[model samples]
Target: LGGYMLGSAMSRPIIHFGSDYEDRYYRENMHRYPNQVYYRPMDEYNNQNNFVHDCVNITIKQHTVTTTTKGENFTETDVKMMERVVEQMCITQYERESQAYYQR
Candidate 1:
């Protein structure tokens, strides 16, 4: 699921402005699930190696995010769960690269 979202987000621009081959793939898969996918371009000055060159940072915050069901407050456990979700989503190598660029 994560990989699929990543791929979909990274290829959004191509899907929007691509040739027939690209359009076919997007139409068949990506377009069917618009709410689940999003796009974010890499920072040119911060990114090196260009592996994710024009890739987007796909996220699922708003949809999956859950506050108190009622009008009550959140618990420590809820916060911890949120933290775990964030940790799971973080790409370590990308984080390292971002830090390296900042250090430079």
Candidate 2:
């Protein structure tokens, strides 16, 4: 019942995403599967490296502001952008590594 499903705070519970057929697949093959896959590569990086991150610093010189009145009117003015500096970086080494890994 809905009440039983919702009122089981003290019960050991888990939510599963598969149907009976999918359940059968895992149940039948569970013995063949490792409890944990891939060892889930981990790292402590950059601390031992001489090279810094590939990130870049950026900025804006000028930018805009606007004001509106109670008469359903609007006004606009050129406003200098607020940030003194912003940074962007490309970081995909982990992604490439993971992609090649799953393909293995």
Candidate 3:
């Protein structure tokens, strides 16, 4: 590989809740699991369905989701997990980005 950054391998959505100057962040360099349930592949899994599918594993709430097959879809539990994952990711992203404004 040249000096040009060739991009990085895919990783799962990161949820960070910390203490002692507590905060959140995401990166491939940290908190990686070898047996993750999601796909970061260049195709198929790139879509939102896969994101939601992966979310099904970790969230404890109930969710309502749709599949391309129309009649096909994730269960309440799966949807809940997916939404929960996305929600946490969004909150953390905002929390980290908003700090700049708070610092001023």
Q: Count the backbone clashes (under 3 Å) in each candidate.
A: 0, 3, 1
Which 10 residues in a row give candidate 2 its minimum summed lDDT?
80-89
Kindly report which residue stretches of model 1 are placed more than 4 angstroms away from their true locations once superposed: 1-41, 44-72, 92-104
In model 3, where is the ten-residue run with the lowest total lDDT?
1-10
In order, what lDDT does every prediction score?
0.36, 0.22, 0.36
- How far residue 37's Cα lies from its native spot in candidate 3, in Å, is 19
lDDT of 2 by residue, 7-79 (tens): 1112111212246664454445333221111111234332211111211111111111112222322122111
lDDT string for model 3 (23-101, tens) is 2322332232211222233334433454334434332221222244356445554343345545545334334435744
Question: Global lDDT for candidate 1?
Answer: 0.36
* Ranking 2 against 3 by lDDT, winner: 3
Alpha-carbon shift of residue 44 in model 1 (angstroms): 5.6
Write down the RMSD of all candidates, one decimal each.
13.9, 24.2, 13.7
How far residue 90's Cα lies from its native spot in candidate 3, in Å, is 1.2
**lDDT of the structure predicted as candidate 3:** 0.36
